[PDB]
Amino acid sequence: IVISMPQDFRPVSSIIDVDILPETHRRVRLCKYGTEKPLGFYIRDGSSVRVTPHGLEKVPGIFISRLVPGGLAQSTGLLAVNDEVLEVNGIEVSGKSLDQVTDMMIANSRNLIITVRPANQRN
């Protein structure tokens, strides 16, 4: 059985800024193979309960709703359903609508920096 040297080297994903971020957050980098394929995950609307300058309120939140099987996001293992999306390439999603956050991801899809608050799986 003949095995060649490696070819077409490509960095796909990583976790960055781990030391300067809250432990409950994860900043992920995704670099898709080519312009034409999808990042591989959908996002939905939702509400997040937070302690605001005025108290505990339920504010609009963005969450991952599913992963395409065999897709990019899924292959990395860095994104799961129920993870809340907080930021996309330096732009926070708080004052943003679902469609805007969707547009932002498509705009930055060739080099995506997405910061999420992972969901915890029951042990």
């Binding site: 003949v2 060649s4 960095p11 796909v12």
Partner: protein, 194 residues
Amino acid sequence: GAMGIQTIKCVVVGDGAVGKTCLLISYTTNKFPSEYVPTVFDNYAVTVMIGGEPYTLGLFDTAGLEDYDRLRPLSYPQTDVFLVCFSVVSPSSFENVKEKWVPEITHHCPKTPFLLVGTQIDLRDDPSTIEKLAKNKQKPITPETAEKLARDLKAVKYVECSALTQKGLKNVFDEAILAALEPPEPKKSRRCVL
């Protein structure tokens, strides 16, 4: 290229600074990273021709530093083969193979095959290196004892290399690729289910 007839997921673990990242970068790009930057999580892909056909090799680099223990299991799901690393001139790294690394991957992925990989073998004959070890009555690890550990810990086999000189470098991955393909049973049964 754009396609592969099979995807082999290879995850690399081992003490901080044993040479995991250089091993990977040296193999895939023929470049030897300059200075040491601890890894948190890095994923790359290359295409390797096996039998004249394209195969996708998904390479997953992990954090040797225990500060990041919490994040490590993220690399484990769907792994086909594991490379457990230790520097042949680092007795402590070798010890951690039996005390942390093999227990950890075997705990998470009980049926996934793993290779024991000795790294930085070009340092076996390095003065500074040999002096410091001896300065505390230590010697490098020999292929003999290394192979014995592989055996005891149930590793597919032991292989050693140097990312710097690339000696034995390609063979570590070829063997990895083989460990992921050879077993007489379905590959799905060997793939980590997490």
